[PDB]
Amino acid sequence: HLVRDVKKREYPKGNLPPDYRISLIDIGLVIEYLMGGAYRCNYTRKRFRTLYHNLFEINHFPFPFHELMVWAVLMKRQKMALFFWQHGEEAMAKALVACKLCKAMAHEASENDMVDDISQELNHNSRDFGQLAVELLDQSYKQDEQLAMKLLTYELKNWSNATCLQLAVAAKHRDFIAHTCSQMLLTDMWMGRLRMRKNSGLKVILGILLPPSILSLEFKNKDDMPYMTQALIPLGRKIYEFYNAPIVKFWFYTLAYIGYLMLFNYIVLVKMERWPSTQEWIVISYIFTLGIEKMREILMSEPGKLLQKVKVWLQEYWNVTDLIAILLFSVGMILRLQDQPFRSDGRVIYCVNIIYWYIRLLDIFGVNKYLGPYVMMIGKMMIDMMYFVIIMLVVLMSFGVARQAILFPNEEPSWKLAKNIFYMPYWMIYGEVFADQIDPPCGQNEIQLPPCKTGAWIVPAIMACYLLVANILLVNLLIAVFNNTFFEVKSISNQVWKFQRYQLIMTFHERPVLPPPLIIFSHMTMIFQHLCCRWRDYGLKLFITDDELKKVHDFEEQCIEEYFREKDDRFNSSNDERIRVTSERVENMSMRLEEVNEREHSMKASLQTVDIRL
């Protein structure tokens, strides 16, 4: 079915003729689809297809166990897929790629609506390749840790020159990323070519505020392991190394974003004049320059087709609400340059943008070890809050309409009616009661008060019942909902936060040097280098040497038979299997020792008969 789906997608027959001997080339095409991304399968490189077509020594692919890992996963052969995984090489890649293929065949089989046991068991198999990856990673941490860094950030040339980290994030394989090896690996990418690690964060801000403090910072050693993309004077290179580090470029965008905030709350409080103020010109710059940066992230995405690149951009929930508010501030900018009444409108359009850029600080605060989970807390709580609000909305209108009828019996059709339905009871659940308007005295000398509109002896009751249902009942529930979901939301959304550390890293490493106000100069170098070399790759890898290749393999197979050794040995010395073994042996002891005494019955009569014979 997979062949049918993507051969018809690429090569535009019917139900595919079953005589079609599916080429290894077409098997290459199904791997690329189930990966997504820019994974170019070894089958679909031009050398493998020219060697295929010239044939239709090199028939024996150099690493046969890798092509049999795919052969097996594509055939849902789980016992052989674990079989091929033990005897082999690059097993961290093999299990992480197979976790990605499994999950991928799982949503495909539900998409075509095949047999539901296929989609069900493909989730479990995707978990099965999953835990063997992270248990093998845990045991590589048990041995020499520095070798295990070079195992993951190895360039996986057979698996489309990737990284085990690049593969695991695409697999959404959370507990790989949250493991201690990969966390302090991502910390190594974060500090960049620096060392510090002692109440850091402060002296990197002090490096930006005071440029001469860059000299005193202990920068990272001359070789170390510089994780890098597609591959007097020392003071100037140390200027460069600080101003290319991802934690540096983050805090330097953060001082630029606080800095923008301090200018876009000032222009909205103070009166704007006909020509924009110098403060507001800095504002108008920062949004548009950041718009060029936002469209650059779309343009330099990993997929090829532009609609697919836009789809990956749409996955980043925050980055799309940047674009909506850049466009929203642009509409308010046009109205601001116009005269009355559009001028007064453009200030209010600016006022609506005030809220969003305040909310855009929450994610920025999401970098911190504790505020980061806390922002993720609030997002899971509001699915529960929406439910709370719908039950709010039934009961609030309950009092809102039933009072508008009684208090104001004779009113014409007007939209003012629906305002007074929602206005007053909704401001009650936050503390107010509107005390004078609860039960105003009526029809009594005071001046005889206006007549009691008949039914006004009930609107105190239905409000009192409304206050107990709103302020007490539901509020206590949303407490009880929140308290009994915080346990699961905390433990998941810590590991979610460790998963989004990866994404943050890759983004700020691609983000240019200069801040969003000054990013036009790093943009114009990017456009100029693009155009002059037109007239004349994402990831952080090491591209290590060939002699170090075999060594990182040899470490890894010693991890393979190590893990398979105590997996067997934990079970030969698990408690419940000792009881099993003893219940067998004894069982053999019962029939055998039945035989011994019953055969020495013959020997006891044999000695007694020889006694008569002697």
Ligand X SMILES: CCC1(c2ccccc2)C(=O)NCNC1=O
Q: Show contacts with a second copy in window 459-488 (CB under 8 A).
A: 460, 462, 464, 467-468, 471-484, 486-487
Pick what 379 binds: ligand X, ligand Y01, a second copy, none; C-beta below 5 to 8 Å, kind-dependent. ligand Y01
406 near a second copy, rule: CB under 8 A: yes
Residue type present at position 444: Q
Which residue lies nearer to ligand X by CB, 103 or 249?
249
252 near ligand X, rule: CB under 6 A: no
Question: Coil, helix or strand for 140?
Answer: helix
Q: How far is the CB of 318 from ligand X (least distance, A)?
A: 7
232 near a second copy, rule: CB under 8 A: no
Q: What is the 3-state secondary structure (H, E, C) of 362-378?
A: HHHHHHCCCHHHHHHHH
Question: Coil, helix or strand for 156?
Answer: strand
The residues facing 61 across adjacent strands are none
Pick what 290 binds: ligand X, a second copy, ligand Y01, none; C-beta below 5 to 8 Å, kind-dependent. ligand X
Which residue lies nearer to a second copy by CB, 151 or 470?
470
439 near ligand Y01, rule: CB under 6 A: yes
Q: How far is the CB of 190 from a second copy (least distance, A)?
A: 22
Pick what 300 binds: ligand X, ligand Y01, a second copy, none; C-beta below 5 to 8 Å, kind-dependent. none
Q: How far is the CB of 287 from a second copy (least distance, A)?
A: 17
257 near ligand X, rule: CB under 6 A: yes
Residue from the set 139, 200, 254, 279 that interacts with ligand X by CB under 6 A: 254
CA distance 555 to 559: 6
Residue from the set 355, 524, 593, 605 that interacts with ligand Y01 by CB under 6 A: 355
Question: Are the CB atoms for 152 and 132 separated by under 8 Å?
Answer: no
Residues 368-407: x where in contact with ligand Y01 by CB under 6 A, - otherwise, as a string: -------xx-xx--x------x--xx-xx-xx--------
Residue type present at position 521: F
360 near ligand X, rule: CB under 6 A: yes
Q: What is the 3-state secondary structure (H, E, C) of 385-444?
A: HHHHHHHHHHHHHHHHHHHHHHHCCCCCCCCHHHHHHHHHHHHHCCCCCCHHHCCCCCCC
Helix, strand, coil percentages in the chain from 3-state DSSP, rounded to 5: 70, 0, 30
Q: What is the 3-state secondary structure (H, E, C) of 473-541?
A: HHHHHHHHHHHCCHHHHHHHHHHHHHHHHHHHHHHHHHCCCCCHHHCHHHHHHHHHHHHHHHCCCCCCE
Residue from the set 114, 184, 239, 458 that interacts with a second copy by CB under 8 A: 458
Residue type present at position 167: L
Could you check whether the bond before residue 341 is cis, i.e. omega within 30 degrees of 0? Answer: yes
Pick what 590 binds: a second copy, ligand X, ligand Y01, none; C-beta below 5 to 8 Å, kind-dependent. a second copy
Which residue is nearest to ligand Y01, using beta carbons? Answer: 379
CA distance 506 to 509: 5
Four-point Cα dihedral 265, 270, 275, 279, nearest 10: -40
Residues 284-313: x where in contact with ligand X by CB under 6 A, - otherwise, as a string: ------x--x--------------------
Question: Coil, helix or strand for 2?
Answer: helix
List contacts with ligand Y01 (CB under 6 A). Answer: 261-262, 265-266, 269, 317-318, 355, 359, 362, 375-376, 378-379, 382, 389, 392-393, 395-396, 398-399, 413-419, 422-423, 426, 439, 441-442, 456-457, 460-462, 464-466, 468-469
